[PDB]
Amino acid sequence: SHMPPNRPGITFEIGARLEALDLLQKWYPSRIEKIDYEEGKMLVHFERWSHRYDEWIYWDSNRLRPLE
Structure with missing residues:
Protein backbone atom coordinates (compact mmCIF):
# COMPACT_ATOMS: atom_id res chain seq x y z
CA SER A 1 0.00 0.00 0.00
CA HIS A 2 0.97 3.69 -0.68
CA MET A 3 0.28 4.69 3.00
CA PRO A 4 2.42 3.73 6.05
CA PRO A 5 1.18 0.70 8.07
CA ASN A 6 -0.99 1.13 11.23
CA ARG A 7 1.72 0.64 13.93
CA PRO A 8 0.13 1.91 17.19
CA GLY A 9 2.49 4.34 19.03
CA ILE A 10 4.41 5.19 15.79
CA THR A 11 3.39 8.49 14.04
CA PHE A 12 4.60 8.39 10.36
CA GLU A 13 5.41 12.14 9.97
CA ILE A 14 8.68 14.15 9.48
CA ASP A 54 21.34 7.94 9.46
CA GLU A 55 19.64 5.00 7.64
CA TRP A 56 16.73 4.31 5.25
CA ILE A 57 14.62 1.66 7.12
CA TYR A 58 11.44 -0.01 5.69
CA TRP A 59 8.35 1.34 7.54
CA ASP A 60 7.30 -2.32 8.34
CA SER A 61 10.81 -3.14 9.77
CA ASN A 62 11.23 -4.96 13.14
CA ARG A 63 14.00 -2.29 13.65
CA LEU A 64 11.25 0.31 14.54
CA ARG A 65 9.14 0.43 17.75
CA PRO A 66 7.18 3.06 19.74
CA LEU A 67 9.06 5.52 22.03
CA GLU A 68 7.29 5.35 25.48
Missing part, protein backbone atom coordinates in the same frame (compact mmCIF):
# COMPACT_ATOMS: atom_id res chain seq x y z
CA GLY A 15 10.14 14.99 12.95
CA ALA A 16 8.08 12.33 14.82
CA ARG A 17 10.12 10.27 17.34
CA LEU A 18 10.27 6.45 17.80
CA GLU A 19 12.87 3.87 18.96
CA ALA A 20 15.16 2.39 16.25
CA LEU A 21 17.56 -0.61 16.35
CA ASP A 22 21.08 0.33 15.06
CA LEU A 23 23.45 -1.98 13.09
CA LEU A 24 25.00 -3.18 16.44
CA GLN A 25 21.50 -4.28 17.69
CA LYS A 26 21.15 -1.41 20.27
CA TRP A 27 17.86 0.60 20.63
CA TYR A 28 18.03 4.46 20.56
CA PRO A 29 15.38 7.20 20.59
CA SER A 30 15.29 8.33 16.92
CA ARG A 31 13.61 10.92 14.61
CA ILE A 32 12.00 10.53 11.13
CA GLU A 33 14.01 12.84 8.76
CA LYS A 34 12.30 11.85 5.43
CA ILE A 35 9.52 9.47 4.20
CA ASP A 36 9.79 7.69 0.78
CA TYR A 37 6.16 6.59 -0.04
CA GLU A 38 7.30 4.86 -3.31
CA GLU A 39 9.92 2.58 -1.61
CA GLY A 40 7.94 2.43 1.71
CA LYS A 41 11.00 3.45 3.78
CA MET A 42 11.95 6.34 6.11
CA LEU A 43 15.30 8.10 6.78
CA VAL A 44 15.88 7.53 10.53
CA HIS A 45 18.25 9.70 12.63
CA PHE A 46 19.53 8.06 15.88
CA GLU A 47 19.32 10.86 18.53
CA ARG A 48 22.71 12.06 19.98
CA TRP A 49 24.56 10.18 17.14
CA SER A 50 26.30 11.68 14.06
CA HIS A 51 24.03 12.04 10.95
CA ARG A 52 26.65 9.75 9.25
CA TYR A 53 24.73 6.85 10.99
